[PDB]
Amino acid sequence: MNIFEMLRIDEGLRLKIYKDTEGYYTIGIGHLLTKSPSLNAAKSELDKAIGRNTNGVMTKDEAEKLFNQDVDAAVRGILRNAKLKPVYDSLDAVRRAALINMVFQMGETGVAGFTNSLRMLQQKRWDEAAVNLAKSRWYNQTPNRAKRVITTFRTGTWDAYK
């Protein structure tokens, strides 16, 4: 299992514009298009991302492509972040994937806000961080996914995705 497969599981794959759990326009593999309420604004961000006049639909290949960019960007956002980098650097490979996932779903900024959890993960206090992570809107709004990520940090294995 790896980051890609992991996220493909959490996010799914849709080739037509759709609304995410927060009601925002999205497409592909969890690729947020816009927070605006306008579908055109969305269509417009789509065309611009892909480089062609799409009419709200895309191919698998295009989806995979945005997905690769998005992953790359998340990692890079983590590395450029003064609060995240050190966490990430201290983690093992599995757990890093968990941190990427969160970053991918919530943005660097969102994640950089879990100060306390972060600190706990840095200290390798697994059970405690898992508790702390759960006391969040994130967990309350998308509890199944949060559970998967949290177990991953708690155990350092992929069992939640098997």
Binding residues for substrate: 32, 104, 117, 132
Catalytic positions: 11, 20
Of 16, 44, 22, nearest in space to 35 by CA = 22
Nearer to Cl ion, 49 or 118 (CB): 49
| Amino acid identity at 48 | K
Helix ranges (DSSP H) in 14-157? 39-50, 60-80, 84-90, 93-112, 115-123, 126-134, 137-141, 143-155
Q: How far is the CB of 61 from Cl ion (least distance, A)?
A: 15
Q: Which residues bind Cl ion (CB under 5 A)?
A: 49, 142, 144-145
Nearer to Cl ion, 123 or 140 (CB): 140
| Dihedral angle sign, alpha carbons of residues 18, 24, 25, 27 | negative
> Residues forming the annotated binding site?
32, 104, 117, 132
Q: Output the furthest CA–CA distance in the chain (Å, rounded).
A: 50
Nearer to Cl ion, 9 or 94 (CB): 9
Residues 6+ apart with CB under 8 A from 19: 25, 26
Q: How far is the CB of 144 from Cl ion (least distance, A)?
A: 4
Q: How far is the CB of 8 from Cl ion (least distance, A)?
A: 15
